[model samples]
Target: SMQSLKSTAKWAASLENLLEDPEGVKRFREFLKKEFSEENVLFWLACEDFKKMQDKTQMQEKAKEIYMTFLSSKASSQVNVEGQSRLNEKILEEPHPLMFQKLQDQIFNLMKYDSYSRFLKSDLFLKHKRTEEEEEDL
Candidate 1:
C-alpha cells in the first residue's frame, strides 16, 4: 500500500482516475477495509468488470447477480441509494450498461465527499505525501 502511495498526493472524485491506477485502487481498498466499507469498492469493481462481458445472456445473469449481491433491498452488502430503488427495480428488468451507473455515481459521491477526503488527511496518506530530501546545493 505504502509503495504506490508515492503516485499522487491527492485523491480525486473521478473513479476513472482511481481505477486507471490499480495500485491506488488496492491501497484505497486497504483504507476502506479499515472502515469496514470495502464493500463499496467491491461493488464499484464489479460494476466496471461487468462492462466487458460480450455475451448477452451472461450480462443479464451478471446483472442479476450484482443486484442480488449488492443492490437488492435485502442485499448482503447493500449500498445506500436512499429511496430511489423503485427506479432501480424498474431498470433491473433490462440489465442495460448504464443501469447501475447512477447507483455507482451515488456511491462514488459518498466515498469522495465522505471517506475519500478523510483518507487524504490520514497520517498514512500524509506519510507518503512527505518529503524525504529537502535541500540540494547542486
Candidate 2:
C-alpha cells in the first residue's frame, strides 16, 4: 500500500507540468488502468520461479527468440490499440535469477510505456523546453 501511494506520487510529480492540460489527468488515469491490467497478465507469467534460466547468456538467447518471434509473427498494426500482443515467454534453458529479474523489469517497463503516451503524455512534448542543465541522462 505504501509503495502504491509512493508510485502514484512519483507519477504525479513526473507529470506535474502536464497536469495543466485538461486531458492530462484523464490520460494518466487511462495509462494507469492499462498499465495495471497489462501487468496482471504479464506478472502472472513472470512470477514463476525461473529455475531453468539461471545463465545470463542463455536468458538473453531465449529472450531474443521471444522478441524475434514477436516481431515475425505479426505486424505492429495487428496489435490492439492497448498494445496487447501475445508471445510465449518460456525460457528453455536455465538463466541467472538476477538476469531473469532484470529481463522481467525490462519487459514490464517496455510494456507499460508505449508510443501513444510517449508522443503525448511525455514531458518532452510540453511547450516549456528543458535546459541542458536539467536534461536527464540515459
Candidate 3:
C-alpha cells in the first residue's frame, strides 16, 4: 500500500511540476499527445507501473521466470482457448498469495475521476476513425 501511495504522490507532484512547464513533462508524456493533461499523466504512470509489476521487469526476472514456467505447465496450460484460463488457475495456486494480493495495492492508487465527462469529452478518448466503415445503415 505504501508503495502505491508513494508512487501516486510522486507522480502527482511530477505532474504539477510539469504543468508549470510542459517542456519538462514532454520528455515523459509526449506520446500522450496534447490531450495528455497533467492529471491524466499521474494516473497513466501509475497504471503503467502497476502493469509492469503485474507483468515483468529486469529486477523481477526470477519471479517472471517462475511465471513462465507456470505458463508452460501441462495441467495448468494449453495453447489456444484454454490457455489464459489455465494460467489464471496456476497463479491462484501460488503458495505466496500475497504476491497476487499486492497487485491490488497498485490498483487502488489509480486516479479518482470525479466526472466521466472530463475524459469522455477528450479528443483522445473519442477518436472513431475506422468505426465509419463499421457504421450501420439504419
lDDT of 2 at 84: 34
lDDT values for all models? 0.64, 0.39, 0.35
Off by more than 4 A, model 2: 1-8, 14-41, 44-91, 108-112, 115-138
Provide the RMSD of all predictions against the true structure, rounded to 1 decimal: 6.2, 13.7, 16.1
Candidate 3, residue 36: the lDDT equals 39
Best by TM-score: 1
CA shift at 49, candidate 1, in angstroms? 2.2
- Please list the residue runs of candidate 1 whose C-alpha ends up more than 4 Å from where it truly belongs after superposition: 1-5, 8-15, 87-91, 121-123, 126-138
1-138 per-residue lDDT for model 2 (tens digits): 122334444544544322333344444544444544333222314333342433567555645443343232443222232213433334334434454445455444553455235434544223252212344456
Model 1, span 39-108: residue lDDT tens = 6778778876786554788877777777777667766556556522544556557887677677677776
- lDDT of candidate 3 over 2-63, digit per residue (tens): 22234334434544443344443443343233443433343334334444555334424433
Better model by lDDT: candidate 2 vs candidate 3: 2
TM-score of 1: 0.68
